[PDB]
Amino acid sequence: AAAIGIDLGTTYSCVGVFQHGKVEIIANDQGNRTTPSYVAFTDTERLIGDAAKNQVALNPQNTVFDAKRLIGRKFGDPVVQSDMKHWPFQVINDGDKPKVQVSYKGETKAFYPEEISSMVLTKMKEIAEAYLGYPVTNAVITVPAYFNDSQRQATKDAGVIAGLNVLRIINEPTAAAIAYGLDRTGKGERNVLIFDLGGGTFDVSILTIDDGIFEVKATAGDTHLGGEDFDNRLVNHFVEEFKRKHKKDISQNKRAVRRLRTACERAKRTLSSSTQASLEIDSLFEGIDFYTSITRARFEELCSDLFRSTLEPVEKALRDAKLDKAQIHDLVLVGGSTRIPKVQKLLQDFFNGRDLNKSINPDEAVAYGAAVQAAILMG
Numbered sequence: 001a002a003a004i005g006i007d008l009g010t011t012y013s014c015v016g017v018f019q020h021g022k023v024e025i026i027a028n029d030q031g032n033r034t035t036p037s038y039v040a041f042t043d044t045e046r047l048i049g050d051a052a053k054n055q056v057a058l059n060p061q062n063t064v065f066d067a068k069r070l071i072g073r074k075f076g077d078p079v080v081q082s083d084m085k086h087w088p089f090q091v092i093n094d095g096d097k098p099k100v101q102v103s104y105k106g107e108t109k110a111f112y113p114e115e116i117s118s119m120v121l122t123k124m125k126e127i128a129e130a131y132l133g134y135p136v137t138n139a140v141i142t143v144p145a146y147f148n149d150s151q152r153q154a155t156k157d158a159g160v161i162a163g164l165n166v167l168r169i170i171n172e173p174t175a176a177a178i179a180y181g182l183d184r185t186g187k188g189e190r191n192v193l194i195f196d197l198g199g200g201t202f203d204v205s206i207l208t209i210d211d212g213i214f215e216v217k218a219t220a221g222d223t224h225l226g227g228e229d230f231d232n233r234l235v236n237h238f239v240e241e242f243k244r245k246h247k248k249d250i251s252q253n254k255r256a257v258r259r260l261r262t263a264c265e266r267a268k269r270t271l272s273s274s275t276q277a278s279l280e281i282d283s284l285f286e287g288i289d290f291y292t293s294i295t296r297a298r299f300e301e302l303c304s305d306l307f308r309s310t311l312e313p314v315e316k317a318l319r320d321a322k323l324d325k326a327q328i329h330d331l332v333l334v335g336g337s338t339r340i341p342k343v344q345k346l347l348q349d350f351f352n353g354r355d356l357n358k359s360i361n362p363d364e365a366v367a368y369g370a371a372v373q374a375a376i377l378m379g
């Protein structure tokens, strides 16, 4: 029975399996190769993944996301206190551990972050089981290189609750390197930069790999920069367009904004492979339909500063690692936002034209490497 590799992400999670000499990333029931790390509580059910994210605008108080931002932290942690200001769901203190408090099955219930993440992992486990045709019991799960013992412990606990034997907790940048077979040479240092621009966070890691041993040389980035920030630039653009067309400001209507955000995220994805995208939202605000379009060039203009801001943490990491740009052997793209052509251009330009490792979907690279590692650990 195959062990699985799971990327338990801030915004999306991904599962893969190594068998018959290759990794396959496993599509969910909707055919999506990544699944939102969202859980929704209703009067009768728990919805997880696509079904939860799809009703986020409808049920904001009882739809939980960003659990990875809480996992393994104390309630009074200044990170927790800050992030709480921005979430539509309630977080409460239970013995200096945060819990998310929701209405569920007609009662007030609270859940630890690891319990929320266990639900996401159960969904990822089920996705794998539907594909494999049998129960999965062993997994490798990934975490950011900056996670401390408590954060690693709580991630493992999520896996255990989900019913998995967690073979190992490994770092996301390590898993990305494993995906590209970067740990297979013997003696001789190989310097690798992992540039990981996700849905909510940006992580740059420089690893030196010597005879299969990984050393973290430097890390940099921004825990609050990611694809949601690009979606938001599109949201504000279309808010202005709606004002010009209808003389109505929708920006204070939480549901209209969330629905617009959903449409913008879809359009953004299309713009990575097409030069234009259409948005069509029925009954956006006061029953008015919104149908519009966006070009790739306009999207790039709207986000130009944000894309550019990703280069300075690369500069800082290189400085900390005491390496010149030219000394990096491999540049590895991770995170779904690195599928944006402008982001690729900026990074490749910064590195004076060096190849980008992007043959594995960047949003799947971590799960891919976790699957390879799970197979190695199973023998």
Ligand SMILES: Nc1ncnc2c1ncn2[C@@H]1O[C@H](COP(=O)(O)OP(=O)(O)O)[C@@H](O)[C@H]1O
Pocket (backbone or CB within 6 Å): 009, 010, 011, 012, 013, 034, 197, 198, 199, 200, 201, 226, 227, 228, 265, 268, 269, 270, 272, 334, 335, 336, 337, 338, 339, 340, 362, 363, 364
């Ligand atoms: N083809 C694409 N083009 C641009 N952005 C994308 C694309 N596919 C996914 N994304 C974005 O990637 C982000 C999620 O990245 P991912 O690496 O899957 O999750 P996480 O950051 O939680 O690990 C989301 O903002 C999503 O909209």
Ligand SMILES: [Ca+2]
Pocket (backbone or CB within 6 Å): 200, 224, 225, 226, 228, 229
């Ligand atoms: Ca942000």
Ligand SMILES: [Cl-]
Pocket (backbone or CB within 6 Å): 345, 346
């Ligand atoms: Cl450019």
Ligand SMILES: [K+]
Pocket (backbone or CB within 6 Å): 007, 008, 009, 010, 012, 013, 014, 363
């Ligand atoms: K992910």
Ligand SMILES: [Mg+2]
Pocket (backbone or CB within 6 Å): 009, 010, 198, 335, 366
């Ligand atoms: Mg990620």
